[PDB]
């Protein structure tokens, strides 16, 4: 059988999380998952499912589960869904239209914001094209916004492509950090490896 307990703690309670442009992914497999316990393991401000009902997860078996995690601002959580547009969905992390999975988020102001600004979390602000679904672009090429070629140097109209969120504790919640975990539930014509307790 499968007998290991799925290692969600590894992803949900990582003490550091990725910048959204550099989002992390962990494949989960060969384990037993209890999604109700997971849901009542903390207080998620968002727990939203596509292609499946949250109430059924413990009855299903998947070929694999993937967990993508990162930090964004509160107001951008709405962008982590199929069919959305905006700087995050367009340039940093894009879900496919046929996505099947859950999007889970919670407010991480106590952890991720620093008095006079945490500048360590970054997002991609400029890009020549929109991401394809599940594209991961970590490049740092200088973006040419004007007529004048950049030759790889920050300048007038030549922009470093990543901007720091700078989370501060007294920000409005829109502009407070949220941790996000996206769980994709994959079904292929192959033996199931991730099941519920029954």
């Amino acid at each position, epitope marked *: 059988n499968i007998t290991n307990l799925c290692p969600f703690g590894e992803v949900f309670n990582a003490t550091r999380f990725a910048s959204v442009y*550099a989002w992390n*992914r962990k494949r989960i497999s060969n384990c037993v998952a209890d999604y109700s316990v997971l849901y009542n393991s903390a207080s998620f401000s968002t727990f939203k499912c596509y292609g499946v009902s949250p109430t059924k997860l413990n009855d299903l078996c998947f070929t*694999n589960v993937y967990a993508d995690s990162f930090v964004i601002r509160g107001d951008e959580v709405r962008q982590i869904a199929p069919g959305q547009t905006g700087k995050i969905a367009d340039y940093n992390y894009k879900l496919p239209d046929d996505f099947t999975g859950c999007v889970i988020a919670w407010n991480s102001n106590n952890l991720d914001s620093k008095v006079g600004g945490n500048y360590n979390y970054l997002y991609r602000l400029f890009r020549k094209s929109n991401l394809k679904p599940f594209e991961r672009d970590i490049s740092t090429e200088i973006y040419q916004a004007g007529s004048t070629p950049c030759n790889g140097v920050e300048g007038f109209n030549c922009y470093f492509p990543l901007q720091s969120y700078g989370f501060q504790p007294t920000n409005g919640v829109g502009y407070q950090p949220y941790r996000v975990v996206v769980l994709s539930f994959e079904l292929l014509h192959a033996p199931a490896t991730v099941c519920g307790p029954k």
Partner: nanobody
Amino acid sequence: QVQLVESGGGLVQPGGSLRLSCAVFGSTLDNYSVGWFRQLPGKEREGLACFSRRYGAPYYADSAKDRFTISRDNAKNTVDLQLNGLKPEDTAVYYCATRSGPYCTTSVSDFDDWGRGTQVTVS
């Protein structure tokens, strides 16, 4: 049944660019993802980049920042890895690998079919 062929390896000079291609024969499905790995002398295999065929989506590992491009040539039907500024430290065995479905990763143990690997040696 699935067999993977790497093309483009061998002896290269520092400074030029390298184009490796991965050709996939006998796949039972079209919905799969293609990873590129290298193995430096005396180290573990490490993932560089992965391409999701369904989503047309490149996925770069932290180690591939700013030198490697992964893409698909729909004419040759290959998944290609381009390395731009060859240094002697680029000398290694490069492999391509596949996994089923559209989810890329650059982790060795997530792929089940491998090519034989191709020696790249930088002068």
